[PDB]
Amino acid sequence: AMQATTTRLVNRIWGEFYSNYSREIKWDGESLGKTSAGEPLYQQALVGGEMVAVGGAVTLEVEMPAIYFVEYMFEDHCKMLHGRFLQRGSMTVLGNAANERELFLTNECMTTQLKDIKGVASFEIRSRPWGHQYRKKNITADKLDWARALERKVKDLPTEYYCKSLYSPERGGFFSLPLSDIGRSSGFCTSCKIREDEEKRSTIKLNVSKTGFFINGIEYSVEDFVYVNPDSISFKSGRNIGLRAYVVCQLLEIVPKSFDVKVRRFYRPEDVSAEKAYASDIQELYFSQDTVVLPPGALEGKCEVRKKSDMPLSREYPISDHIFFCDLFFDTSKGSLKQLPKFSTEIRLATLDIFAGCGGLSHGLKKAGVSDAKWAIEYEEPAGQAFKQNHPESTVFVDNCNVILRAIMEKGGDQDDCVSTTEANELAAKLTEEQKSTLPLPGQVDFINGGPPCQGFSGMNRFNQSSWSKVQCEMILAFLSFADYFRPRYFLLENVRTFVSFNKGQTFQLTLASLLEMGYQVRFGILEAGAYGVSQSRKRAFIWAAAPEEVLPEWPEPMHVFGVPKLKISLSQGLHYAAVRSTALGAPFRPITVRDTIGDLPSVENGDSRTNKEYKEVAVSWFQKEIRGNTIALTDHICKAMNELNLIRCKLIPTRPGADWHDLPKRKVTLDGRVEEMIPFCLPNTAERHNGWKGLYGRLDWQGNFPTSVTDPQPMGKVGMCFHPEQHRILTVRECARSQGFPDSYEFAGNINHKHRQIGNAVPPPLAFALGRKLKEALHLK
DNA sequence: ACTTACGGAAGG
DNA sequence: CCTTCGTAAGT
Ligand SMILES: Nc1ncnc2c1ncn2[C@@H]1O[C@H](CSCC[C@H](N)C(=O)O)[C@@H](O)[C@H]1O
Ligand SMILES: [Zn+2]
C-alpha cells in the first residue's frame, strides 16, 4: 500500500495520474547528379523566400497541414520534390500522451511539385547518445528545450519539430531512424524500394524451369514438404476439440491448368484416434499414398520430414523447429499402421527482475541463454523464498520496490531526482550496510524485466476504483523509473491483455510515452500462452524496449493449434495490430490437452498434504516426458481441503465434459446437525446476468484445456473449472504448475495458498523461453 | 482463516 | 448477444 517512488521524468510524464505528483521558386546552387531517367538532382531551393533543403521538412495543405521530410528534389521543366510523411504524435497510438513538437517518420512518401508547398517547417533530427551517464545532460537539455518552446508559444511563433524514431504501425511500434538511408539526395528512396519489393512478393510467379513458384516469397519446389490448411484437403475450456493441425504434404507435381499442385499426404497420430495421439511424439507423421490436387494458394509454408535417426539431438520444450519424422505407414482403407517398406537429410546480460515472484519469467529467460537473474526484487516472503530456492546464485531483496529504488537512488547521490514518500525514505534508511552494498548500480544492469501487478487492470476486479487497486496500478511508474534510472540495453514488460484497454488506454499510451521520452525503441504485442505448448487460455500483453543502437526482438511464432482469434491492439484511425497469427485454422503441432498434462500423476484424496511423494506410473505423453525430465521426487501434489458441504456437492457432479453446478439436485442436506441447501443460493440468484455461471463447480475435460490460472482456485469462483476430470477434489498445486508449463523439478514455498498464488501469478516458462530465444536472435543480430 | 456473494466493459 | 477473466463481506 505504498505510493510509487519515481524519477522526476516519469513523474512529469504521468502528471495528474500519479498520486505523489510534485511566388518565387528558384533552384539554389548547381546540380550534383542525375537520376536513372536523366533528371538533374538538386539539394537546395527557394520557394517564396523560405529555404528548402534535402533533410528538412516541407508543408502541404490539407485540420492541420501535412509535413513531409524532403528526400530528393529534381526536375517538362517542372520542379519536383519527393518527401516521406512525418506523422504527428497525436495521430499515432500515443494519442493524447504525445508531445506537440515530436514527429515520427513513416514509410509513406509522395512526389509533388514545388508550387504546392505551403511553407517550410523548422525541423530537426534528434540523435542523443545513449547511456546512464548522459542522464543529467539530457535533463538539462530537455529543460532548456521546454523553456524555449514555452517562450516561442507565448509569443505565437512557428513550432520547431524534432524526429528521433520511425513509427511502424504495420510492425506495431517505434523503431530507430535509419540515418544512413534518409536524405541521400540520390534519386533513390528506401521506402519506395521497400514498397516495390512488398508489391512484387505478393503474386503467383512460376519459376523459369517450370519446377517451382514464389508464393509469398517462399520458393516452393518439387520434392519439398509443405503445409496445407486442414480445411483445404463445445463447452467451457473445451473449445480446442475438433481443431486440426496443418496437413503435411510432399510437393509431387506442378499440374498445368495459372496452375495447380499435386501433392502426397501425411497422417498425424491424432488422425487415427485420441488414444494414439496421447501416446505419441508431437513431431510424428505417418506415410500414406493419397494424392490431392490443390490450388497454389492453399500452401501455408514449408517443413522438413526426416527419419527417426536423423532428428536433431537438441530437444526443447517450446519447439520452434519445423521438422517432423516419419517411421510408420498408415493404410487409409484398412486403418492399420504398418512399417515403412524421399525424406530430408557471450550474450548473457546482467539482469534485474523487479516483481520477481517465484521466478517464472526468470527461469525461461535464463534457460534461453539471455538472462543472468543477477538481482531480483519481490516483497512477499514466500515468493522470495521460492525464487531463492530455484535461483540459488541470485541476489534477492525481499522488500518493497519503492524502497529498493529509493535506496539505489540515495546510494548514487541522486536524492534530488527521487520523488518518494516519507515512509519509503524511512524504510530505506533502515537497511543494513550488507544489503546496501549488494544493491545494483547503474551501468551494471543490461536487462530489466518483470511484470507489475495486474490485479488492478484485470477485468475480474469488480472494485478497480478502490485505493488498493489504484495503488496496484501505480507500480507501472516504479518499473518505468527503474528503467529510466538504470537505462538498460533491453527492457521487457508483461501484464494482462486488459492493460492496453484499461482507462480508455490512457495507462497504456502513457507507458510508451514514458519509454519514448527516455530515447527507447518500443514495440508492443499480445500473445496467447496456449499456442506455445501449454493447455491454458492465457492472454498476456508484452512490451519490448531497446536502446537505439540495439535490435528490437521479433515475436515468437506460435506452433500449436489453439481456438483463439487474432488478439489486436487498437492503434488509431481504425488501425489494428496483431503481433502473431491465429493458429485456430492450422498450426505445425496439435493442441495440448488436460490428459497430456496431468494424465500420469498418482491419485490423491481431498485435503492431501504430503509435500513429498513418489511417481507411480511412467511418462506416456510427449508433454509428460518433457515436464518430468529426470525428476524422481514428486513435490507439491497437494490439494486444498473442501468442507463437508462442498465435498458433498463435488461428488454429485457427473464426470462428463460440460458438467457444472447445473447438475446439482435440488434437495436439503444435513451435515453437525445443520441443514443446508445443495444448490448454493448465490448461483441461481444472479445467474441471469452472468451467463448462468457456466463452469462453476465444474469438472475439467480430459480432451479440453485448463482455464486461466488464478491465485486461488475455488469451486465458486469467476473461473470455476477447478475439479479433477475424474477425482472428487480440486486440482493440486503440482497439476496447476504443470498447466502453467513449470518443470516438475521446480519448487514453491509457503503453505498451499502461497504456492497457489505463486503459480497463478507467474508467466508460463515456455512463453518466457520463446521470448528469450527471440531476444537471443536479436542480440546476435547486432 | 475460510466461505459466500458477485459489476461491467472489451471483442466476436 | 454471447464469451472472457478478482475483491469484500460474511462466518
Ligand atoms: N511493490 C512491490 N515490490 C516488490 N514486489 C511486488 C510489489 N508488488 C507486487 N509484487 C510482487 O509481484 C508478484 C507478481 S509479478 C509475478 C511474478 C513474475 N512476473 C513471474 O513470472 O513469476 C507478486 O507475487 C507480488 O508479491
Ligand atoms: Zn519514396
Author numbering: 624 to 645, 708 to 747, 752 to 764, 767 to 924, 934 to 957, 966 to 1049, 1055 to 1058, 1090 to 1415, ...
Paper text:
In plants, DNA methylation occurs in CG, CHG, and CHH contexts (where H = A, T, or C), with the maintenance of CG methylation mediated by the DNA methyltransferase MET1. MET1 possesses replication foci target sequence (RFTS) 1–2, acidic-linker, bromo adjacent homology (BAH) 1–2 and methyltransferase (MTase) domains, whereas DNMT1 possesses PCNA-binding, RFTS, CXXC, autoinhibitory linker, BAH1-2 and MTase domains. Of note, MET1 has two RFTS domains and lacks the CXXC domain. Arabidopsis thaliana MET1 exhibits a plant-specific structural feature in the autoinhibition state, and a conserved activation state compared to mammalian DNMT1.
Flipped-out 5fC in the target strand was covalently bound to sulfhydryl group of Cys1198 of the catalytic loop in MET1 (aa: 1196–1210), and recognized by side chains of Glu1238, Arg1282 and Arg1284 of the catalytic core, in which side chain of Met1204 occupies the vacant space after base flipping of 5fC. The spatial positions of the 5fC and 5mC bases in the hemimethylated DNA were strictly restricted by the catalytic loop and TRD, respectively, which ensure the robust CG sequence methylation of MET160. In the N-terminal region of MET1, the Activating Helix (aa: 631–644) was adpted to a helix-turn conformation, which is similar to the conformation of the Activating Helix in the activation state of DNMT149.
